[PDB]
Design a protein around this ligand. Structure first.
Ligand SMILES: OC[C@H]1O[C@@H](O[C@@H]2[C@@H](O)[C@H](O)O[C@H](CO)[C@H]2O)[C@H](O)[C@@H](O)[C@@H]1O
Length: 394
């Protein structure tokens, strides 16, 4: 009977309360939807195991590239009919340019975009003032300012890789991208030991050895990391859109910082093309489709209530008074969006291999190794390369 919708803890608990009410409001196709929260820790395995044992949902959000893995396994339901319905009802024309096309394959649309989770740098003005330093413009200035911030008891580059916390993972890849590197070649081949990647990892290790990265960062959960921001421990670091609201400190002291240049002049921001996906295990495919169209139509309410930690994929939402009046949001649009790249870099096309990269053990372990300075850059990257070859399909 009921359409099962699984959703992640995208922002604050209040995000899930609101998304629950939206979902449970669905009464289309003489059908209903149930809402269930899947935790971030081990999410890849949670979905993989549910789908394989036929106990998974009809519809879900989840990993940025998860839909490609399940499509390869033949467990996704293509979203072509949803796309048609959005064209008829008018919503399709409201999509931002380039947001739908990444999901088009030979066999259909694997999913529908719903938000863009971008990785801005943030700072706390009071702590930069206290340390007597300026906002970094590049890696060399990040390190200098970081040392001074450490000297006044602050964390110069806040991150975390504890259970449920993927921000550390994202930092590893963001810094590679920021130095003109990336996991892949232009043609989508693995290129982990590229020299720009080595430099990026050497820089992170230097932040770790100098105490600019907190020596316990490896252990920090999402709550731990948010608390560092809320309680004026974190001076600078990479997080998400809407950090003040996410951490419960809207004094105005926490502000978006400009992107910084790598040592060769490169600029990049990391972005995740998040999407809603439908599965073959549904009591009714028509109902899955109705639910998805209904849900996309109500998404504006989440940005209206300022409950999201991501960019919208709909033009009308990006023009909503609540969105543009926040200068942090405008700075992200203007300075991060134009330089944004995904995990596919230096390729562009998305694929199932991104699912294994994003959700798998190799990236997690690489991150924890770097954040503890357990080994040298080349060794860590070689272990990373090797782990990815074990799971990616060449
Ligand atoms: O790498 C796994 C997934 O990470 C998602 O980002 C999440 C943030 O939006 C949220 O605020 O924090 C959690 C826990 O750290 C993050 O995992 C990406 O948006 C996904 O695309 C990605 O699959």
């Amino acid at each position: 009977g009921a359409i099962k919708f699984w959703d992640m803890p995208w922002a604050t608990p209040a995000y899930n309360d609101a998304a629950k009410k939206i979902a449970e409001g669905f009464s289309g196709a003489n059908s209903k939807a149930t809402y269930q929260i899947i935790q971030w820790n081990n999410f890849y395995q949670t979905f993989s195991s549910a789908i394989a044992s036929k106990t998974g949902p009809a519809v879900s959000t989840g990993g940025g590239f998860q839909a490609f893995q399940f499509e390869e396994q033949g467990q996704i339901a293509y979203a072509d009919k949803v796309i048609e319905k959005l064209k008829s009802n008018g919503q399709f024309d409201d999509f931002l340019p380039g947001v739908v096309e990444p999901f088009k394959t030979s066999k259909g649309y694997v999913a529908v975009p719903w938000q863009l989770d971008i990785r801005p740098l943030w700072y706390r003005k009071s702590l930069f003032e206290k340390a007597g330093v300026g906002v970094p413009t590049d890696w060399a200035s990040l390190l200098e300012a970081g040392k001074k911030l450490k000297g006044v008891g602050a964390v110069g580059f806040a991150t975390g890789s504890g259970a449920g916390n993927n921000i550390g993972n994202h930092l590893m890849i963001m810094m590679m991208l920021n130095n003109g590197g990336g996991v892949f070649t232009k043609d989508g081949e693995l290129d982990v030991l590229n020299d720009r990647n080595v430099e990026a990892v050497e820089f992170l290790l230097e932040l770790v050895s100098n105490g600019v990265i907190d020596p316990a960062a490896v252990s920090y959960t999402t709550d731990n990391l948010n608390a560092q921001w809320k309680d004026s421990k974190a001076a600078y670091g990479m997080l998400t859109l809407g950090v003040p609201e996410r951490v419960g400190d809207t004094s105005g002291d926490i502000v978006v910082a400009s992107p910084i240049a790598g040592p060769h002049g490169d600029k990049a921001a990391l972005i995740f093309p998040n999407n809603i996906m439908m599965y073959t295990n549904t009591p009714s495919q028509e109902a899955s489709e109705e639910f998805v169209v209904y849900y996309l139509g109500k998404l504006k309410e989440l940005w209206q209530q300022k409950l999201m930690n991501a960019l919208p994929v709909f033009k009308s939402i990006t023009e909503m008074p609540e969105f543009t009046a926040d200068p942090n949001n405008v700075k992200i649009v203007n300075e991060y969006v134009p330089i944004a790249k995904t995990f596919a870099s230096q390729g562009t096309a998305l694929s199932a291999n991104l699912a294994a990269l994003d959700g798998g053990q190799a990236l997690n372990q690489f991150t924890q190794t770097v954040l503890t300075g357990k080994t040298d850059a080349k060794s860590a990257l070689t272990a990373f390369d090797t782990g990815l070859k074990s799971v990616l399909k060449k």
